[PDB]
């Protein structure tokens, strides 16, 4: 069964674990034992993924980390993608966003070499620079909407042309891209959050920051069945239960939750892992007992 | 003399050689004699350098097609980069863009690994995903503004708040961070177009595509100092005379313009690097005179 994907295998990975928690994988050379090198970032990966293995549902190693020591250090990065089981999806956070000859080549990247199953994208640029990921039919391409950082607020939330914020135009043109790549799927769908992902587990998904719930809030509704990555909890103080309990759907999935410091420097780290699982599922059990 | 830089190194290099052209070395799989390999890409790349040197005043590798090729294929950028002369400018086109922590393992990876002297950078997250290259004092920070391609007519050109379109806002916070990165020196400058780089040859950079003519008026006009890469002359079939008037300076400068296939595929490579020289000197000879 070389048919892994994004989607399907990660629903199955969610349901299998019962966690929504993903684990990032940033080498910072400053976490590093002294002197950093490519060798110790692989290292580094390798203890995380041990690990946090039973508690996680995707692992979202960072590109930059890699790339900042240089070609060994891709090289680690591809030894730590080919060390994430069949069962798990990888989500290779590299934020590309280039025109259509160019995306095409970081999608092989992502994908063919690097041999991730999902990547993230920035589409300032527009839909020409989401698409060429999406030829890959069974890969997750997530497209950042409102970023967890300060500056977000700078351009992201700038009134666009009754006035939208930015993030929520860029997610409404997410919404319609995922809609024109399952354009051709039976419709409606026949389980209901048929936008998320179509029949190769492959679709598009967005990227919000947990930090801002206005925002999710936002998102939400207008991408109603899309994944959603949220970014902030742990290193940036971001409130956790308010963040699920405007981005999670009906079936309390629909976003994944992405945690990297607040792992990595943890004294236990299968311990840590599993604990933000365990609350992040106190508020799943809410949301899905309101509706039955 | 380990002290080369971005833009002081460029304005040498530009009235050495006479020349706004700007190289791209992007090796297209479909380029390559096949099968394609990372070694096939630098032996590509070199022949490039090698013939059209005379000529350029910049060399802008596209890590996507480095990237295409794993591991191998950044081996190969950061050999294809070691191989352009110290007078030179290397631009790497790689337009990164991420958050504080993330963004300085990128400008890192660009600076003290690949040895770049200026990269490309995507703004849509705010200043906080380009004043961690800027802390690289000498080096260049090209932000894209207003890009070439078709789509950039979907997000790009959306009025923002007399309302202005996306861009130009974009534009405009750039020359407000170039401004920031520059208020400690003696002002007003004593040469002019101070805000185009800082003392050590390092400063922030626009790219708008040469394709619209109205976004390089309006940019210039938010920027009139600032240097303007302008993609689209050859392969996107853009108006080179035209382009040039809109986004030259005064002085005939603050202009590149990169082109790729339209020299790599061409029967003779440094001909052609140098029709495109000579046919853009036509128009910089107007401009110049005119204040004259």
């Known amino acids: 069964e070389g048919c892994k994907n994004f989607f399907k295998t990660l629903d199955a990975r969610i349901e299998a674990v019962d966690s929504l928690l993903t684990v990032g994988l940033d080498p910072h050379i400053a976490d590093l034992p002294s002197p950093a090198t490519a060798e110790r970032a692989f290292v580094f990966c390798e203890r995380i993924i041990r690990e946090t293995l039973p508690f996680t549902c995707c692992y979202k190693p960072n590109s930059a ?87 977000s607020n700078e351009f992201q939330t700038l009134p666009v042309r009754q006035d939208v914020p930015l ?37 598009v998904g967005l990227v919000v920051g947990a930090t801002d719930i206005e925002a999710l809030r936002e998102v939400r509704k207008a ?33 994944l939750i992405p945690v990297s410091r607040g792992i990595s420097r943890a004294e236990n780290l299968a311990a840590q892992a599993n604990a933000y699982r365990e609350q992040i599922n106190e508020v799943r059990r809410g949301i899905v007992q309101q509706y039955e």
Chains 1, 2 share one sequence.
């Open 65 to 151: 980390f890699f790339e900042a020591f240089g070609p060994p250090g891709l090289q680690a990065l591809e030894r730590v993608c080919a060390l994430i089981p069949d069962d798990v999806p990888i989500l290779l956070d590299a934020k590309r966003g280039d025109i259509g000859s160019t995306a095409q080549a970081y999608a092989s990247s992502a994908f063919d070499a690097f041999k991730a199953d999902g990547v993230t994208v920035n589409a300032y640029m527009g839909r020409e620079a989401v698409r060429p990921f999406l030829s890959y039919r069974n890969k997750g391409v997530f497209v950042l909407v409102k970023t967890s950082n300060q500056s």
């Open 223 to 255: 991408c109603p069945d899309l994944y959603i990555l949220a970014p902030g909890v742990g290193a940036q103080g971001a409130d956790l239960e308010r963040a699920l309990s405007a981005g999670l759907c009906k079936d309390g999935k629909g976003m």
């Open 167 to 203: 993030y929520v135009q860029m997610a409404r043109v997410c919404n319609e891209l995922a809609q024109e790549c399952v354009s051709e799927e039976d419709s409606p769908s026949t389980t209901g959050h048929g936008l998320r992902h179509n029949a190769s587990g492959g679709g």
